[PDB]
Amino acid sequence: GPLGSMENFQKVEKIGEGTYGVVYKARNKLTGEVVALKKIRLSTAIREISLLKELNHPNIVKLLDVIHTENKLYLVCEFLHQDLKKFMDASALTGIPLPLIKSYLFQLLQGLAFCHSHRVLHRDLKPQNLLINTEGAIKLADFGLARAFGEVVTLWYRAPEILLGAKYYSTAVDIWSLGCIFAEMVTRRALFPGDSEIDQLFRIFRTLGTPDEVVWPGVTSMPDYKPSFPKWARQDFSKVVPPLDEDGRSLLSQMLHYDPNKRISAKAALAHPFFQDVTKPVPHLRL
Ligand SMILES: */C=C\C(=O)N1CCN(CC2CC2)c2cc(C(=O)OC)ccc21
């Protein structure tokens, strides 16, 4: 078995918890490069991961290297300046400026359209794995594998078809997660902050109404659907995202359609009128 493969990286800071391991800010001992290092404590996933090394896009965090040594798996990523959760917390008193929200949403839709055009799903979009830099960019990170391998799981961004037991995800799950993040940037509160699967499901139901066959054909036959679910009425989007103009509200409503077949795709969303005046502002970052 392999050893000595990682003495070329000196760990500088602990910067989060990825989808399968802890992530450090590290410094390439040899080249001086500053990177983000995911350590997965341990294949068909050795190939599914290495395919992500080819998935290069301005709005996807660059996967530089996979280092499989000594019953541990390392992912070497480019390092970005801040993640969206921290920036949202830092902007709690003022709010992220709406043009910057719109830039960030637009860029993430571009990243997803690229990912989805390659039939790659993220599966677990969260403010914590959206990374931003000083230049105005935002990038997708920590893609969830179809094969899980290797804190507490956040459920707040989970699409309802996942919660309802759907065995096969579509790209629509990522559009749902990003809609939730969009709303959270605008209102400065999480849209659906459940603390269990059923609390998550029912928080969605209380806001968007309990889905039935009318709005979601097939919902009542899903593995975890129960006829005994409470029947809540749908609230109005004027109540859910007050600061958002009608263009933003209509886009968000389309990202949160219950039926994954009705949910807007990333590429369709790019053409939505909400982006006809999109710009690329600079965040104010305290690093
Ligand atoms: C290559 C490391 C990697 O896989 N990721 C995804 C995990 N994270 C953060 C994790 C969600 C808490 C992460 C962060 C960065 C970064 O630059 O943070 C400042 C880069 C890559 C990765």
Numbering used by the authors: -4 to 37, 46 to 153, 162 to 298
Quote the paper.
Therefore, we proposed that merging acrylamides 1 and 6, to combine the Leu83‐directed H‐bonding ability of the ester and the Val18‐directed hydrophobic vector accessed by the tetrahydroquinoxaline scaffold, would generate an even more potent analogue. Altering the quinoxaline nitrogen substituent proved to be key to improving kinetic selectivity, with the shorter N‐methyl analogue 10 being less Cdk2(ES) selective, whereas the bulkier N‐methylcyclopropyl analogue 11 showed a significant improvement in REF. The crystal structure of 11‐Cdk2(ES) revealed that the methyl cyclopropane functionality extends beyond Val18 into the ribose binding site where it picks up additional hydrophobic interactions, which presumably account for the increase in potency. Indeed, comparing the binding conformations of the merged (9 and 11) and parent (1 and 6) fragments, we observe a subtle shift in the position of the core scaffolds and the orientation of the acrylamide link that likely explains the jump in potency that resulted from fragment merging. Accordingly, the concentration dependency for the rate of reaction between Cdk2(ES) and key acrylamides 1, 6, 9 and 11 were determined using qIT.
As a method for conducting allele‐specific chemical genetic investigations, non‐native cysteine residues can be introduced onto the surface of a protein, against which electrophilic probes are developed, such that chemical inhibition can be achieved with a level of selectivity that is typically impossible to achieve in a native system. The high degree of active‐site homology within the Cdk family, has meant that developing Cdk2‐specific inhibitors has proved elusive and, as such, selective inhibitors of electrophile sensitive Cdk2 would be highly valuable tools. To generate an ES Cdk2 construct (Cdk2(ES)), we mutated the gatekeeper phenylalanine residue to cysteine (F80 C) to enable covalent binding in the active site. Additionally, Cdk2 carries a surface‐exposed cysteine (C177) in an allosteric pocket, and this was mutated to alanine to facilitate compatibility with qIT, which relies on the presence of a single surface‐exposed cysteine residue.
